[PDB]
Amino acid sequence: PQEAGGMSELQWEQAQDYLKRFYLYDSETKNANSLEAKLKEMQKFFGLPITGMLNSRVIEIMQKPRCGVPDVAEYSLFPNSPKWTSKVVTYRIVSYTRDLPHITVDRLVSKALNMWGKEIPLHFRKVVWGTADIMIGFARGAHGDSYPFDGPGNTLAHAFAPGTGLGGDAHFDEDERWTDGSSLGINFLYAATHALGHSLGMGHSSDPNAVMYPTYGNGDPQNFKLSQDDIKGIQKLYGKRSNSRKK
Template sequence: MQLAVLCAVCLLPGGLALPLPPEAGGMSELQWEQAQRYLKKFYPYDSKSRDVNSLRAKLKEMQQFFHLPITGMLSSDIIKIIQKPRCGVPDVAEYSLFPDRPKWTSKVVTYKVISYTRDLSHFKVNQLVDKAFAMWSKEIPLQFKRIRVGIADIMIGFARGAHGDSFPFDGPGNTLAHAFAPGPGLGGDAHFDEDERWTDGTSIGINFLFAVTHELGHSLGLGHSSDPNAVMYPTYEARDAKDFKLSQDDIEGIQKLYGNIYDFKKE
């Protein structure tokens, strides 16, 4: 949900501001600009066809994803969603990083934490990463092995701003993290914005367990879910850490990729 600096307001002769299209829904110019940037990032469209019809179509797409009335017009409900912190991976499947439903083919997937946050101890970060992997491995026939030397399948780290993957972080709030689908190079890697205030749930901030469990879902090949109860829902919501677990939607999604661990154990 990157909020870039607003462009200067275009003025008509005589000093009158350019009127907003009906799709702006009576919202302010600032809100309309924010919505356009949000749609561009999370519901991408061809830059050659950036007309009112494209914006209307993308607004409808977003409304459908979040189970809102499908009007093709900006609304206060959309503004509320835009203002929430969230994952940096797009919501639209065909434009996301997961168009071909990639997955790991090895039964043992390695991971490595290559950089840490100043907000939590190295021990606590490692502990929460292990816990997140355990939540996923409980449902599928994959084993996850942490390595300390060499290149792992999934490289996990914290960074600020531009960090070498063409998806720079945007400072506190907005985009919290992103991850890449299984594959070589950046494939599977998960990055977290060090400008956030990360917590283990004992203080105010972004709960790292919630975020890393979500991003590792992407690292395993899952896209976003429109189920607000799912770990793979794109926006961040503070939850009761004691009750935090994968939803049925998350479980069904990951088992479509890798199979059911219980059936696997019977073989």
């Protein structure tokens, strides 16, 4: 909490490790000098300009929630594919949270997922009989998977990469707050575009107006939608397109 930067080694480790979990679990790189190199990468990935340092904006974000998905791969059980390679993608809800009835959760995922679908030539299909590729469920890290519950705050939602039928699923930290009309904690619409975006193998982006922006913050937009730099990125791989925007 601000002083994390100049805290004792034990508390300080939490800061260094908070970035580390958001990337991967590699005990080799754990080091006090190596710290400085890896931070360089955090700053480009995040976008923030201040670099080689941490305490003010860098920490402000570690403590602030964002996402629970790693951003890299190394010694783990996952396939190698940048995006979905299936002919069609599908999605179904497993369970629902008391904050929102089942229909509401469901229509939010479609209202976000579809929004991605329109920005790409992939073909998406609605579910009415049987299981689907992407399962959307509420659960805690102790449901039977890696990534722990870590309580509310830090770590917002883990999700999986488009891998096989089982992999590709999306999840929501049930501990976290979830709503839409109340507009109090995390809007489902907003996180859904992010969580579902990770089910497409999209990586984060640095623009401050990005949809996967890892620096959660910004004001309260009117309707809100896919961003410019985020769209061109996915298009460059599914086809060919370019663009530029800042602020």
